[PDB]
Design a protein around this ligand. Sequence first.
Ligand SMILES: *[C@@H]1O[C@H](CO)[C@@H](O[C@@H]2O[C@H](CO)[C@@H](O)[C@H](O)[C@H]2NC(C)=O)[C@H](O)[C@H]1NC(C)=O
Ligand SMILES: *[C@@H]1O[C@H](CO)[C@@H](O[C@@H]2O[C@H](CO)[C@@H](O)[C@H](O)[C@H]2NC(C)=O)[C@H](O)[C@H]1NC(C)=O
Ligand SMILES: *[C@@H]1O[C@H](CO)[C@@H](O[C@@H]2O[C@H](CO)[C@@H](O)[C@H](O)[C@H]2NC(C)=O)[C@H](O)[C@H]1NC(C)=O
Ligand SMILES: *[C@@H]1O[C@H](CO)[C@@H](O[C@@H]2O[C@H](CO)[C@@H](O)[C@H](O)[C@H]2NC(C)=O)[C@H](O)[C@H]1NC(C)=O
Ligand code: NPO
Ligand code: NPO
Ligand code: NPO
Ligand code: NPO
Ligand code: CA
Ligand code: CA
Ligand code: MG
Ligand code: MG
Ligand code: ZN
Ligand code: ZN
Ligand code: ZN
Ligand code: ZN
Lengths: 481, 481
Amino acid sequence: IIPVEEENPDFWNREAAEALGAAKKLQPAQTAAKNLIIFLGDGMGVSTVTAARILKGQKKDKLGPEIPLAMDRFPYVALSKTYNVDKHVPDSGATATAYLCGVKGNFQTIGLSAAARFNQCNTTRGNEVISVMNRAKKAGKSVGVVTTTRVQHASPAGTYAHTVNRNWYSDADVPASARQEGCQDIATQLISNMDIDVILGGGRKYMFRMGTPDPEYPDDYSQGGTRLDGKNLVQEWLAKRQGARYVWNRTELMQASLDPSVTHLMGLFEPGDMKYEIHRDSTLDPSLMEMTEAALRLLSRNPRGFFLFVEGGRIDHGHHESRAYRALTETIMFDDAIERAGQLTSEEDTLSLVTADHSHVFSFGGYPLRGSSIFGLAPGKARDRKAYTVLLYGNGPGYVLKDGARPDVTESESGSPEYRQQSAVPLDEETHAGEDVAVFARGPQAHLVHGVQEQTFIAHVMAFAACLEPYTACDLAPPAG
Amino acid sequence: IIPVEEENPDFWNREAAEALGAAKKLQPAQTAAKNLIIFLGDGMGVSTVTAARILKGQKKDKLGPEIPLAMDRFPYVALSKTYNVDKHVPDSGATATAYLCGVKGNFQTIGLSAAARFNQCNTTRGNEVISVMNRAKKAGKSVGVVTTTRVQHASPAGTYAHTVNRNWYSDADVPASARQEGCQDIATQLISNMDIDVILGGGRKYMFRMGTPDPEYPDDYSQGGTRLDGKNLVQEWLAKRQGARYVWNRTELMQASLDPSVTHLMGLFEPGDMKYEIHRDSTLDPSLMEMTEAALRLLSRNPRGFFLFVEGGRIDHGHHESRAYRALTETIMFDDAIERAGQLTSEEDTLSLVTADHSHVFSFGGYPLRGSSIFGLAPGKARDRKAYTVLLYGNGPGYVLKDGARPDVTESESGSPEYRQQSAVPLDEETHAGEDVAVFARGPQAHLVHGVQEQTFIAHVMAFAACLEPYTACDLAPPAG
Ligand SMILES: *[C@@H]1O[C@H](CO)[C@@H](O[C@@H]2O[C@H](CO)[C@@H](O)[C@H](O)[C@H]2NC(C)=O)[C@H](O)[C@H]1NC(C)=O
Ligand SMILES: *[C@@H]1O[C@H](CO)[C@@H](O[C@@H]2O[C@H](CO)[C@@H](O)[C@H](O)[C@H]2NC(C)=O)[C@H](O)[C@H]1NC(C)=O
Ligand SMILES: *[C@@H]1O[C@H](CO)[C@@H](O[C@@H]2O[C@H](CO)[C@@H](O)[C@H](O)[C@H]2NC(C)=O)[C@H](O)[C@H]1NC(C)=O
Ligand SMILES: *[C@@H]1O[C@H](CO)[C@@H](O[C@@H]2O[C@H](CO)[C@@H](O)[C@H](O)[C@H]2NC(C)=O)[C@H](O)[C@H]1NC(C)=O
Ligand SMILES: O=[N+]([O-])c1ccc(O)cc1
Ligand SMILES: O=[N+]([O-])c1ccc(O)cc1
Ligand SMILES: O=[N+]([O-])c1ccc(O)cc1
Ligand SMILES: O=[N+]([O-])c1ccc(O)cc1
Ligand SMILES: [Ca+2]
Ligand SMILES: [Ca+2]
Ligand SMILES: [Mg+2]
Ligand SMILES: [Mg+2]
Ligand SMILES: [Zn+2]
Ligand SMILES: [Zn+2]
Ligand SMILES: [Zn+2]
Ligand SMILES: [Zn+2]
């Protein structure tokens, strides 16, 4: 459909004039950032962003592509080069090292330089690289990790852990030789490496000994504790801190986030990853946006500021399943969380970066009409006289041959939350993609986010803006009020 | 392969420190742009850019992803929203209207507001939107159109033409009713609508009457003149201007570009589109980089400055064939032309924008090792136990079923210049993609290129920087020396 108002050149001329005016108004801060927020859309490449924009636009009864996402309103944009040292198409572990520690590493390692080797515990020591979040804590800031994945997953783990193997969630995952050599599982590192004021997400199971019933699924043993060392990491964590509270559900999170006496908060809301937003139990589980607000309630209390990590962690997972409906609905909730954080913090003193660790082989094509569903069919048949979808994958589990040929697709089918878009190559999981991702930035020193940068730049600009090591001689004035 | 130097965190810390220093040094101009250059990579989305970077990096005996493209060195980056008014996934015609005239239009129309309708001649009048190039000419600047496609193709046509139908190359293409109603073919508009100082690219055939032997293929009648109105548009064009020269080959282009008496230059180097760079006859045909230099030699003579359009027009075509080797080799030559223009002009007085009209459903995935060929196989077999390529398409003519199944692929095969990467959906031509593309900017007022913008912003920022209508009251100081 053609919006009548857009037929008039004046519409476009007025908008562009408005855009130029806004562009001219942009000025760099002379002051430091009190607070640092990184919003990480795991797997949220450029094609995910645009597709999510269209979906969200239509959610609010608009045509789609013309409505800005919250992230679209960020003034400063750069392209981020995501390659790991050893692989062109990266993983979450080694990209975390780049955007959180400012050093590139090798595929599937976390918080380690590329002198380390994956799954070789004895290459660990001397290669630990300290995250910006760790450095923010050392400077007396409060720090928060918020994600819809396990809190021990690769991305959040980049804020606190150093490991040659991202799969080492609990001691149960670490080979005897590595345990003997002192390589700690990530759940242990979560509670031991550094003080973290707010930890919100999934990953209950790795914190408790085998046999421990999950409090929310006490009748499903696969959801229970995983530990073989007899440790209760939650109790150990609680015992280390006065003001500390552990919650496993939304109601308790709410109570804690408003409780003046709660100084340390660990909320682990599922045994593993949190449910997709479309499957979330809104009585039992906080959304990413709600966890973000909960984190902000506690973190904002520290006069010295905070570092907050917020991950749209299951965007990635949606794409891996080649279920764009899940990828994009996670992306919109991620954008809602970004919007909410913006309402609760001031760009006068808060440097906010939105980025992705890497992209996916997700594409948005065909020649669909303005206002058509992103989950719809491309107008016109493919060369095999069957329909195809506007959303497709290069590879992944949507590759199907029914009776020797590519199956036809209907709108009802293509529009289902369970639908897997077709791909060129069958894989159990769709792969990451290696192309540049966006960095969006707002707040003090955000203007430094520019051009085409190595992914490591994200960590460095944040450390610089807050005058953290190695930029304590930042030469910036104190954060603005 | 893991580069030893990258194993040391110092390598990454030093680079990022260097990046921060460079970022801090950036300052906005207070002065206008004397010259305007738009480099348009047709179809050159984010995944094309990164893939081209890797290929070019390895061309110069490096690992790939760590080596900047010429365009990567541009300080200012924005994301551009490419939707046409009527379609989410756009064409070149209506995107040209946006980035050249500053108004969005309807799919397959050029230089017209969205009140016009495709292929309806009688909806033309009153909807003409004037390009920045036209406005630059009105202000006394010299103007140049340089492309590897027909000069009457959608992109270059956006600089000078207004038509409801991009397919109207010569009068032979225009229906009788439209001819009767005064809708001029693009070749006529090329010579009639405005004065253009330099016109370089393909499209000889549309300029000459049927029966006219092409001077370069006088034995292939399909390459001859197409016109049914008896017009020789080249002679008509030459007759309109003293100092005017027509060339159809590289040697004559060279001579003209250095000739002080040549004030108007039309070089049409193929009957239709120019050959892919990999097929170019370097004795008969100028590369895009050479045409760019030829254009610059003449355009730079005007003390009032110039507007130059330079298109990597066949990047798009490579992707349509799903032959990434062609898409990416065109992209590298486009980047070489960008580099060359930068050596021949000063960012003190020249605003240079590099962008794409739209992207393609091209993806870069699998998990290939550092330094591996971009045209190589993903490590490890697909779910069907056959190999697959790191480069794939969502749709297009690389979809194959040999004997009921996805064919295996070898490195020798995947690496051929004729190889079509596989896709999920068979189409004669791979489709454009609707996701945001990059805008890169350098020079006076380039800092205004920021954030996420409508594609129309490209035209407006250029007009504003040069203080052209509708921004003659730009409030900028004269261009710097
Ligand atoms: C990490 O530990 C492994 C396992 O013992 C070491 O690998 C051995 O190295 C020796 C000497 O090169 C070889 O002869 C053996 O074949 C290796 N054993 C295995 C099981 O692979 C390795 O050298 C250690 N690396 C460091 C940094 O100490
Ligand atoms: C959220 O978690 C709280 C804290 O564990 C749960 O509160 C317990 O509920 C049981 C059963 O109703 C009671 O016997 C206890 O008094 C509660 N424990 C504490 C320490 O408060 C609560 O039930 C959970 N909410 C939901 C909806 O499951
Ligand atoms: C453009 O020309 C076409 C062709 O004559 C016009 O279309 C006709 O419009 C009348 C009135 O609505 C219809 O009864 C006919 O069916 C149409 N004919 C065809 C061939 O489609 C159209 O109205 C013209 N538009 C303008 C702006 O004048
Ligand atoms: C490039 O174009 C020029 C100009 O048309 C060609 O020059 C002509 O060549 C023919 C055959 O050799 C001569 O009879 C004429 O004297 C030339 N014409 C003019 C006006 O100079 C030239 O041959 C072309 N070059 C190539 C390599 O084909
Ligand atoms: O032994 N276990 O793992 C158990 C036992 C009881 C229960 O409700 C849950 C788990
Ligand atoms: O847990 N919290 O602090 C919350 C919970 C729900 C909500 O809507 C906002 C904040
Ligand atoms: O009639 N024609 O189109 C012709 C005739 C002669 C020739 O060499 C080329 C084309
Ligand atoms: O036609 N030209 O002006 C040219 C031709 C070739 C070249 O290498 C540079 C410029
Ligand atoms: Ca739960
Ligand atoms: Ca030629
Ligand atoms: Mg993650
Ligand atoms: Mg083009
Ligand atoms: Zn990831
Ligand atoms: Zn992933
Ligand atoms: Zn195009
Ligand atoms: Zn195209």
